[PDB]
Symmetry: C2
Subunit: 293 residues, 2 copies
């Protein structure tokens, strides 16, 4: 409902969201927006674990708006049982599969409001696999008639597409018992570990659904979703996969799991994937991690 | 409250460790067989900060003090289970601050009994400093009739919120916090550390010091949690000494913030020198980074 200001760094945006947990980023969920000729498809942004639409997209969303897209973002996976779930603005703690249902409702609203046939979708971290749930289980895709898919492009950053070894926690990654973390961390934390039930089910039979064009971006220095290459997808029949290492061609971009959202290079990569025939400017600028290394 | 963790050299790995073992002791600490030597006859008691514990706070300071020849002791205090943050593992000192003095009294008595010593020296990080001052003022850490028999001889602090904080790291967002809505979320300790809070008012009423105590009060120019940083400094009352130290004086490359610099070699030297004035302690000057970029 309220609109917060444009941001350039993740933790300031998070702090703002902790006092305004339902805020929208600039340029987002204007339900009067009409797709243009250059950009027929609305863009749906899907946040990550313990995050919201504001702290995830307070830079990406304004940039996509200035580029001429209609931009939309939901908040999802909200629950109040886990400890972290009780903190303001930490969403997407609920077990992940039903996220696809929430996304479906939202996407229907967006299509309904814009008269477009399809949307494009960007997902951060859990967002990505939440989006894939929608693709696989909740009608994002149409197995019998791929051309009718409601999602045309899935773009993701840091997505835990095949779970994470949590390499950044060092020796502590293995001490995490999948059974004791839900009450504290929330079930989604457990759903993103290696070979979780949800990920075995999500990946059973393949990474892709036909018709969808996937752009899967990872950062070398991501230490939340690890090894970082596990984010990459393998194309199945009738699908396209472009896996991008954020650093190939720009080693001075040191984005991590969080700072990648405020990297001008990542925004460029996203805009490129959204407008492949458009000569998009993909910068190569420095960007730092959140922590000092 | 007796598993011993490894020495650490960075704060966040220590905090992570503690989250899986929230009663861990830093090395060299709470050996109740330890007898103070003649060169260092006072035990050292370490008092942690808000949302912290003895491990993440002193997993560097304690091993270093132990190798310098002190008997080292540390407690966890201010544990409550009503606030949301208070429910997370190893985030202690969320309870309202004043009564922490009482816990410290208990602990100090067990230390004196265990070692035959007349006094202790004490070190406090952030809330630990004013919690320590609570003990000094309201729970018998000082003796008005006979200051010579104060149970505490030295109080050394770092980043202590001795006169409350403006939270300048939050910029204009700090003015947006409502002191009545944060207790349930962050713990009453957070509200007690705000400027002119009831607790700080009663604690500082009538002066910063008690007779017979030597105060070494350290702040860092880059501390942006206990702000303005100079507010930590104390004014000497009657029968008291205050040595107000800015960590960056004589070493502008030490860029420690509120958390790092618990892991600064310079800070550790400063504390060792305050403990051993006549001992020609080496105080290095070395580069140390903030926790964030
Ligand atoms: C150093 C990497 C360790 C693994 C990363 C784990 C935490 C990453 C969280 C990213 C989202 C924003 C953080 C806010 C919620 C913190 C909860 C937590 O620390 O588990
Ligand atoms: C993208 C998936 C991210 C999952 C990361 C979750 C783990 C990161 C570590 C967080 C600190 C450890 C949390 C401690 C909770 C233990 C609770 C318990 O079982 O008692
Ligand atoms: C949902 C209830 C809203 C009321 C406020 C909730 C606060 C959540 C945000 C906290 C940001 C950090 C505030 C830091 C104050 C700590 C004071 C200190 O450590 O000295
Ligand atoms: C969770 C363990 C951390 C212990 C203390 C945490 C401090 C939380 C307070 C945040 C409000 C202050 C604004 C942050 C500025 C960061 C600069 C610094 O750390 O010195
Ligand atoms: C995406 O990753 C798969 C394997 O994980 C690889 O076969 C494929 O070539 C990659 N695609 C691109 C465009 O890099
Ligand atoms: C801090 O202590 C110094 C001595 O180190 C003293 O001269 C000064 O007055 C004190 N500062 C304050 C604000 O009391
Ligand atoms: Ca919630
Ligand atoms: Ca503190």
């Amino acid at each position: 409902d309220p609109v917060g200001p444009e941001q350039i760094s993740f933790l300031p945006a998070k702090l703002y969201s902790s006092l305004a947990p339902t805020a929208l980023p600039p340029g987002t969920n204007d339900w009067t927006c009409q797709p243009s000729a250059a950009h027929p498809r609305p863009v749906v942004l899907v946040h990550g674990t313990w995050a919201n639409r504001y702290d995830s997209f307070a830079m990406i969303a304004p940039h996509l708006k200035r580029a001429g897209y209609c931009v939309y973002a939901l908040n999802y996976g909200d629950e109040n049982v886990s400890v972290l779930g009780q903190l303001p603005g930490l969403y997407a703690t609920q077990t992940i599969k039903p996220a696809g249902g929430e996304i479906s409702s939202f996407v229907d609203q967006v299509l309904d409001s814009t008269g477009a046939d399809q949307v494009d979708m960007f997902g951060w971290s859990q967002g990505g696999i939440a989006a894939r749930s929608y693709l696989k289980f909740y009608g994002g895709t149409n197995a019998a008639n791929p051309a009718a898919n409601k999602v045309k492009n899935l773009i993701t950053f840091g997505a835990t597409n095949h779970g994470t070894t949590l390499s950044g926690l060092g020796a502590l990654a293995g001490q995490l018992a999948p059974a004791t973390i839900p009450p504290v961390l929330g079930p989604a934390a457990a759903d993103q570990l290696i070979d979780s039930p949800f990920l075995t089910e999500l990946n059973a039979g393949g990474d892709t659904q036909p018709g969808v064009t996937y752009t899967i971006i990872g950062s070398r220095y991501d230490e939340v979703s690890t090894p970082y290459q596990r984010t990459f997808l393998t194309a199945g029949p009738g699908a396209t996969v472009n896996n991008i290492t954020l650093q190939n061609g720009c080693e001075i971009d040191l984005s991590d799991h969080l700072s990648g959202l405020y990297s001008y290079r990542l925004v460029g990569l996203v805009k490129k994937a959204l407008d492949p025939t458009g000569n998009v400017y993909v910068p190569c600028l420095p960007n730092a991690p959140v922590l000092e290394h």
